[PDB]
A paper describes a structure:
CP forms the capsid shell that protects genomes and is responsible for both host specificity and receptor binding to transport the viral genome into infected host cells, or for intracellular trafficking. Analyses of these capsid structures reveal the intermolecular interactions that drive subunits assembly into homo-trimeric capsomeres and eventually into a complete viral capsid in which specific domains, such as the N-terminal domain, the helical domain, and the β-barrel domain/C-arm, could encapsidate nucleic acids.
From ~11,000 particle images recorded on a direct electron detector with a super-resolution mode on the FEI Titan Krios microscope, the capsid structures of LSV2 VLP within T = 4 and T = 3 architectures were determined by localized reconstructions to 2.4 and 2.6 Å resolutions on averaging around the icosahedral symmetric axes, from a respective single dataset. Accordingly, the T = 4 LSV2 VLP is an icosahedral symmetrical sphere consisting of 240 copies of the 57-kDa full-length CP with 80 apparent trimeric spikes on the VLP surface, whereas the T = 3 LSV2 VLP is composed of 180 copies with 60 trimeric spikes. Long spikes (length 3.6 nm) protrude from the center of each homo-trimeric capsomere at icosahedral 3-fold (I3) and quasi 3-fold (Q3) axes in one T = 4 capsid, and at Q3 axes in one T = 3 capsid. Besides the overall differences in VLP diameters and CP numbers, the local difference in T = 4 and T = 3 architectures is that the icosahedral 2-fold (I2) axes in T = 4 particles exist between subunits B, C, and D in two sets in the quasi six-fold (Q6) arrangement but I2 axes in T = 3 particles are present along the C/C homo-dimeric capsomeres.
Numbering used by the authors:
A (entry chain C), B (entry chain A), C (entry chain B): 66 to 513
D (entry chain A), E (entry chain B): 417 to 513
The structure:
Amino acid sequence: AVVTAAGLAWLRQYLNPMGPDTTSVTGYPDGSAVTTCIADYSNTFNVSFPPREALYCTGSSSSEKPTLVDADNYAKIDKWSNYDITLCVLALPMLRNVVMLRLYPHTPTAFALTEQTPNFPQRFPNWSVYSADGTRFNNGDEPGYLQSYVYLPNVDKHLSAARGYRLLSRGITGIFSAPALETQGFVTACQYLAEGSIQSQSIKSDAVRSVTVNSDGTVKNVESSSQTVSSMPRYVFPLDGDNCAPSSLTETYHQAYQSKATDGFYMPVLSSSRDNPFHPPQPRAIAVYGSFLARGCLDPVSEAHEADGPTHDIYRLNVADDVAPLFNTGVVWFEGISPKFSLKLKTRTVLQYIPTSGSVLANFTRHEPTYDQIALDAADRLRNLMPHAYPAAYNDWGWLGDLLDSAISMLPGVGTVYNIAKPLIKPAWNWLGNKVSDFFGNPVARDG
Amino acid sequence: AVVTAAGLAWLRQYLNPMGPDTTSVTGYPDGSAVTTCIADYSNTFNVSFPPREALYCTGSSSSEKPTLVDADNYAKIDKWSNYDITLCVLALPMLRNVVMLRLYPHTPTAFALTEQTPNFPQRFPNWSVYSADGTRFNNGDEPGYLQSYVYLPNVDKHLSAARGYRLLSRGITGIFSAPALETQGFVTACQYLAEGSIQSQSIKSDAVRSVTVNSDGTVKNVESSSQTVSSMPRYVFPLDGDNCAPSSLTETYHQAYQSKATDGFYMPVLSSSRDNPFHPPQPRAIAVYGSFLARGCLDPVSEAHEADGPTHDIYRLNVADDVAPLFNTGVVWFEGISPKFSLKLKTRTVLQYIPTSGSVLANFTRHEPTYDQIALDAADRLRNLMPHAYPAAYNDWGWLGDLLDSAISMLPGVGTVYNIAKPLIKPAWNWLGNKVSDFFGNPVARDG
Amino acid sequence: AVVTAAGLAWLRQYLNPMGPDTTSVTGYPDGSAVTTCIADYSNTFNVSFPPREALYCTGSSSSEKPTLVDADNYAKIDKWSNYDITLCVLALPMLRNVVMLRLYPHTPTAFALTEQTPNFPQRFPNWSVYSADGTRFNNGDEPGYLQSYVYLPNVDKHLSAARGYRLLSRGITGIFSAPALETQGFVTACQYLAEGSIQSQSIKSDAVRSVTVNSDGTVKNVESSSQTVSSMPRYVFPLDGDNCAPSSLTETYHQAYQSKATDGFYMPVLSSSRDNPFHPPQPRAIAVYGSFLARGCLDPVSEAHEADGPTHDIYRLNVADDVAPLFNTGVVWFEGISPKFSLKLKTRTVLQYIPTSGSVLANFTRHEPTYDQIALDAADRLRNLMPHAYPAAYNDWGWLGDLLDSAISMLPGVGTVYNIAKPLIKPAWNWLGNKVSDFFGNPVARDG
Amino acid sequence: QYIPTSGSVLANFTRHEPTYDQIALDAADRLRNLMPHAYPAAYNDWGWLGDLLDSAISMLPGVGTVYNIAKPLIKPAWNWLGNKVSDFFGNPVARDG
Amino acid sequence: QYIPTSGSVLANFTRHEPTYDQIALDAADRLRNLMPHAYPAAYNDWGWLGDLLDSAISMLPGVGTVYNIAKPLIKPAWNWLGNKVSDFFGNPVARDG
């Protein structure tokens, strides 16, 4: 009838993954009664404007040939460096490939994605170029943007050796810096659930046409294999790419975070569900789910037009991974950034494993199947009222824990002993105008 | 620890969508903290025996040609009009295409469905004819029944412009009338969860057979492409068509509603789940899930017979839509109806949207992310004890709200302050014999 | 605010399916308000070392020919009978085919499964032989192990005649015996959730190659159909076959049961979820989910290598069934068993039906849609702290019910009236060393 | 009721409480001669049945009686043709259909 | 505000509470002649508005008044050029931009 210590610790690391006090690492409070090993991956990447040597092309040029650097089309990308730029990060719930970095000459109207599968998507220090017309880039085209994946290798190496896993928490911090007199820019952050699923797109086969004209050979096998079948199963994410523009996100979600660029960001991605069960590792090809062109049988049609129905485009990412289901997809945008910026990305991913016998993880297990129902209910309660992100320097929340968690742990049901803990009001997170008030009306003087 | 006003209003519109007091429209009480726009679609259709001009044929006759009216086989359908008829409505959870109307010469043994995909299914004012042998109808066959879809166009137009949606409530009313001295007939209504899912049926490819007999041409590519693959993914509904006969529904479900025909009906379709999350629009081809013929590997067989296993027939509807998951499928039957009847269908569908930026919905948003846990728990509690339908004129329930909702809002957990609200007894909804008693023993004198 | 009698009875049969006091049969406490019929299937099988007449081969030898007995390779299996053996039973949640028996000459390193689909898997009295190299067995190979399915025919016959079903409880008892002076051996038991799903494996089509060399015939249709498509949908179980070795199971799960062989076993398989909804019968081909060989797009690759990505092997069982979702998969191992053993398997499967009108089940319905929330919460609570199995003779648990269920029914939320029921401690189930203590510290003197 | 044959289908549906109640049998034998042979098709859920008729008549058999007096029992008048129907306790029957 | 035409797009967005409030209309008619015609672009969220100005002026109309006295109302001085701005209750306006 009261939150335990372990449940409270889990709640604190789940809501504040990169808070300074989160030193101990604790598991999900459900009493799984299974030997588990919890791993904490902290990584840091200094991302800036890439030089030409780390810049490959995804077109059919690098199709069978390995990665092809840019044949000194880098002049156009220098032209980008003349003006201000835009930098998106997209944190899908994939376990490895923690985030997708993307660099634009200027803010796009939507999070476009190429129809054709790219060639050799590049891990972070390298980038891959895409054309301005939303197609893959071969040398001699017009570069549209740069893209890269931030890859955690230890996560792969450990996920190989595990019966099951579950993501405990994940946080991404964006310490931003730029030369003095060029600190201009804005930052926007938003989380939302993009519930992926294993789907296969609808494709067509090819009808064989043989015309034997020989004196005895007159078979004429004109049989039509050109029917509609299902492609490979892929894990498909329904992120509304057309609606991931910054302004749309700000006006849609009330917990979205906005600030000047120098504040950076700190996104503690949150689970969208209430239970977090173990899953066997299942690396699959990831794809992102587009829109449909032909209305098809959305209108009265014939049998022949049942096939070309509302089939949504599926954009292959050419990246395989296993995803943490029920976790929010995060996205931040930096607009009007000076091209000679410097973003220090810090990712902290803590996740639980069930070690496979004889594997490396077996030597690190740590056994307390603690149970705490109240912590889970409190997390489900708090999901809908935490801000989506905070300034990069905003850690060690005074309101968290002894105040917010305690005040909200008395609401669930009537599992309450303390009569009243503390009144809870609606916080006002106006970082742009320095009028920030936390959940209890206390103001927030600037700590950076 | 007490139901709010907004939660109560949502509960009232969810349980009584077409009640007279439901003037205000309110959203799902989960505090989604998202800019939302709630739309209320009220539609009315006067359905009667169709004339010949509004009656098309679905056979291969109208395959590439557009819809083909009946070549004055309408004499047989007049013969139908000689005797009494039967009228089914099937309310699947599809957002548009609110209901499926179907007209039978006499009550069928099951809700049959054609194996071959029909041609040009018709929106309500028009109908489409199907043969008596459970096949599509070409001119010169024996007509078996008529079918049509009741289509809401504004729902489509708005669903185009939305990031996400969720169905809040849906009600269907069936005001029935007929000439005096021909009021004879019966009405039956039942709801049940038919949990659809995205499935692909198993089909076969075609093996190519080339016999080059030329002096140098002797390739003989006899390779067999005749393997088993997966067809298009479709949203498949597991409605037991073989068991949707009226009598079976009455004897299976205790909340099923039965009455004389003149009472009409009023079905407030209910959600089968406890949470109602947003979903991106996903129009897919709808299909209904049949039964299997060949037992296949249900018995010890060889590899070659693994393929022809228990593959269930999938009946394509040739209709594309996106469905409200977790909502019950409703069905009503009118038996022994005078053929010159008149049914006024009134559908009220209220559903929430997340507007896309710049779309029309953006001008109508209305922002109060109210939270009310007790309302959700009360709805989950009440799901299993509300009647499936009421007489068409039975609105403004005295027992609802101040009595039923209040009495049942004290059960959940022990989140209770008022000591005792009101004893709750088992109601007796015997509309046929005029012995109706509500949830508190009060009787129901006839209001129509 | 207190557990009902019906809820308590359901809890007792769910946790102790084969306890002597479980005479009455009761349904799931959710108040489904549906006409239901509960069936109780109790079966007994005396399994021992099979003789040659009941021993078929699964290789391509018995491909189109029906089952083929062993062409007196039975000498090698007698050689097995010279030494000690190993006997696994694998209780997947399939409704019919209650368990899979498997016999090994000596303990394997993993629960291997053949890549090629076997021929004519045999029901229990017969067995099917598999080669030592993990392939199907034709006469003249090296036999690796024997396998059979324990099939319940009445379950099939009743599942044909039902709108919907749900598994209420299932227990498997393993009364073990052997000639005196040969009682040596060990027994291990473990349950774990293997959440299956309808998946289709990725396969390839075949590219047609026609070279018309005729004077007028020069078509040369070289079109490539050799693309990647999806195979048949199958219900796929993610059981970690590589990690089902006995020692790994013992060291992974803390509730795993270990004892000397003569103790037998008694596994009350438990649901892994909290709600148990009805489902329509859906017999599908069952398959077990393997591992992947080629890393594919787990590394930066080209489009052509997106196809050969991490595709996991799917082992077809050549058995069709419909499964009880959310129920644990059980597995027991008997090591070092004298080859002339005798295992009396007793399975009790109790499950609910919604009868189809006019079917046989309709004559046996029994209507009390009892509701009991507390029983469901108590079951969810108890899931994680019950032992996975008990000695075959350990029934009629004193601690169960009046003590364990009562003590734990006061924890959920604060729905508690009795101040304190009884302190609950951590039980110590050390059956090997005769130091067994139940949940309240009381010891367990040996009852057999 | 059935006694299932071993291995038959009925064996899977058995339901075991050999309840004994002598008073119910005596009450049924008593009531046999004074129940109407039929009722209108819509006449179910008899108010007089059970808590009133069965209780009132369960005290007659022998002297196996604890409650002093339950309720006086009169001769009902089932005149369905003329809408003058009175049940076993004089209460009238307004038409329910 | 709109009255939607049947079947039109607006019909899907209707929102029904025909609220009546006479006092609000009278207060608006009263306030029309004494509000400034415009304010500096950054001058929003008026402290004097509503709880002070509307409340103080809602007691004037007729004698439909319950609260004895709300707050004295003086003549504001909107001198934005010289930074000598005083609102309707004499409180000054320090520059917010």
